[PDB]
């Protein structure tokens, strides 16, 4: 029997749009954002946490040659998320009831700030409501799908890879989860993935 849920983030619970981004990036003179998205790229670097906010802006200012504000910056960047539906923030408190809940995702500080602040606030619900504990790429240093960021966590959290259920859009994702003996299930762009547990 499953008692722990791997929550992702992008897609699973917020709503993405690349095009939007890439658009308020142009707007603010980044004309080539869309050639920019390499594994020494500050996008992947910043993924991992190798390099800080202040780093990645500035990366981006480089590649940029402009004056730019760290806060437009900041908004260009965070316009790739959308939202969090508030009937995911209802599943996931209902879900807290029957299983230990986690997250795990390859995100970003400044995006993860973002959504601390923009998406999770609920009624009286903040971020510590929805799960046990957050797993981020850029904190631990690693990013899915590498096996070692699925080893990491379920140590961590002293569960066991075989009672946990780990829901992501990725593919390869779950593919690697699976791996380790982590049941998956992979739902599609914008999908209401509630039907699991009816
Ligand atoms: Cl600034
Ligand atoms: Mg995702």
Same mark, same amino acid.
């Given at each position: 029997?499953?008692?722990?849920?791997?929550?992702?983030?992008?897609?699973?619970?917020?709503?993405?749009?690349?095009?939007?981004?890439?658009?308020?990036?142009?707007?603010?003179?980044?004309?080539?954002?869309?050639?920019?998205?390499?594994?020494?790229?500050?996008?992947?670097?910043?993924?991992?946490?190798?390099?800080?906010?202040?780093?990645?802006?500035?990366?981006?200012?480089?590649?940029?040659?402009?004056?730019?504000?760290?806060?437009?910056?900041?908004?260009?960047?965070?316009?790739?998320?959308?939202?969090?539906?508030?009937?995911?923030?209802?599943?996931?408190?209902?879900?807290?009831?029957?299983?230990?809940?986690?997250?795990?995702?390859?995100?970003?500080?400044?995006?993860?700030?973002?959504?601390?602040?923009?998406?999770?606030?609920?009624?009286?619900?903040?971020?510590?409501?929805?799960?046990?504990?957050?797993?981020?790429?850029?904190?631990?240093?690693?990013?899915?799908?590498?096996? =070692? %960021?699925?080893?990491? @966590?379920?140590?961590?959290? /002293? *569960?066991?890879?075989?009672?946990?259920?780990?829901?992501? #859009?990725? =593919? %390869?994702?779950?593919? @690697?989860?699976?791996?380790? /003996? *982590?049941?998956?299930?992979?739902?599609?762009?914008?999908? #209401?993935?509630?039907?699991?547990?009816?």
């Amino acid at each position: 029997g499953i008692k722990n849920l791997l929550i992702d983030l992008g897609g699973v619970l917020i709503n993405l749009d690349r095009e939007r981004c890439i658009e308020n990036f142009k707007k603010i003179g980044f004309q080539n954002i869309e050639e920019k998205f390499q594994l020494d790229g500050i996008f992947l670097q910043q993924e991992k946490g190798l390099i800080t906010p202040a780093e990645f802006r500035d990366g981006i200012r480089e590649m940029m040659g402009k004056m730019v504000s760290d806060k437009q910056i900041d908004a260009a960047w965070n316009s790739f998320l959308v939202d969090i539906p508030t009937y995911k923030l209802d599943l996931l408190l209902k879900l807290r009831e029957k299983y230990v809940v986690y997250l795990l995702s390859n995100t970003n500080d400044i995006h993860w700030k973002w959504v601390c602040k923009n998406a999770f606030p609920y009624r009286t619900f903040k971020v510590e409501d929805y799960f046990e504990k957050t797993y981020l790429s850029y904190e631990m240093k690693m990013a899915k799908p590498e096996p =070692e %960021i699925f080893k990491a @966590v379920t140590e961590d959290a /002293g *569960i066991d890879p075989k009672e946990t259920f780990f829901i992501d #859009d990725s =593919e %390869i994702n779950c593919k @690697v989860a699976q791996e380790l /003996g *982590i049941s998956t299930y992979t739902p599609k762009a914008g999908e #209401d993935w509630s039907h699991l547990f009816r």
